[PDB]
Design a binder for this molecule. Structure first.
Ligand SMILES: NS(=O)(=O)c1nnc(NC(=O)Cc2cccs2)s1
Ligand SMILES: [Zn+2]
Length: 257
């Protein structure tokens, strides 16, 4: 099955998922000088005050913190979006070294990790229907650099020992995702895809300009997770990022000058 190793990594995905070579694949390199300011772009509206987190799961590729999305509790609106997108889960991609780990790059620069807050368009009724639509998802992407600790990330870091291996889950209630956001909501936006199989071209990507800083100890704990299940040979969950894909016929728009 697919993964991030030598024999099943991103260069192999197209064999099971031919859309891997499609017209709107993600991630991409964000060339900041080529991105065009669009003064018609609205400010982002992030309303996470009523967010209800449920649990955290190691899925063998990353870990997902999942939310109750059966009501408008945590929603993303505005920006390039029409309508309301409901938060369903967040996860990260990270490196084996601080010099790599992000999926999007900025003028070819790689960050240590990248946070993805995944939202689905409520007009499609549920996530499964939404991913079949070109405007089905909105993923808010936030870069992580190594520096000062992010206090709002610590509760995530501390539960990771309980989900070390593939298939392990733990209760994860009352987590506030607002503690993962940077100060500024200036963003770049472009139409793209899921960055893991099935690689569906259903995502409006909104990537924040300002990274958050996390500590060396915090990202070190991400790297102690396992791709494998318990009782299988240990393989550290690191470098679970897809590299930049061709931009093709797309324009990246910026919300800021
Ligand atoms: N890296 S990414 O954000 O582009 C993604 N790639 N695949 C994804 N699949 C899902 O979010 C399905 C799930 C919904 C709720 C729990 S899992 S997100
Ligand atoms: Zn992701």
């Amino acid at each position: 099955h697919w993964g991030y190793g030598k024999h099943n990594g991103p260069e192999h995905w197209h064999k099971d998922f031919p859309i891997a070579k499609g017209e709107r694949q993600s991630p991409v390199d964000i060339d900041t000088h080529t991105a065009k300011y669009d003064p018609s772009l609205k400010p982002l509206s992030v309303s996470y005050d009523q967010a209800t987190s449920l649990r955290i799961l190691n899925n063998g590729h990353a870990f997902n913190v999942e939310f109750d999305d059966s009501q408008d509790k945590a929603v993303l609106k505005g920006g390039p979006l029409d309508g309301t997108y409901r938060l369903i889960q967040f996860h990260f991609h990270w490196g084996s070294l601080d010099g790599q780990g992000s999926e999007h790059t900025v003028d070819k620069k790689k960050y240590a990790a990248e946070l993805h807050l995944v939202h689905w368009n409520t007009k499609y009724g549920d996530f499964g229907k939404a991913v079949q639509q070109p405007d089905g998802l909105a993923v808010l992407g936030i870069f992580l650099k190594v520096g000062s600790a992010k206090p709002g990330l610590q509760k995530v870091v501390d539960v990771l020992d309980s989900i070390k291996t593939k298939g392990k889950s733990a209760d994860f209630t009352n987590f506030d995702p607002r503690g993962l956001l940077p100060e500024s909501l200036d963003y770049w936006t472009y139409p793209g895809s899921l960055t893991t199989p099935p690689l569906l071209e259903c995502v409006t990507w909104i990537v924040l300009k300002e990274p958050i800083s996390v500590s060396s100890e915090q990202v070190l704990k991400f790297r102690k997770l396992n791709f494998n299940g318990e009782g299988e040979p240990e393989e550290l969950m690191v470098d679970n990022w897809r590299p930049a894909q061709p931009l093709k016929n797309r324009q990246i728009k910026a919300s800021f000058k």
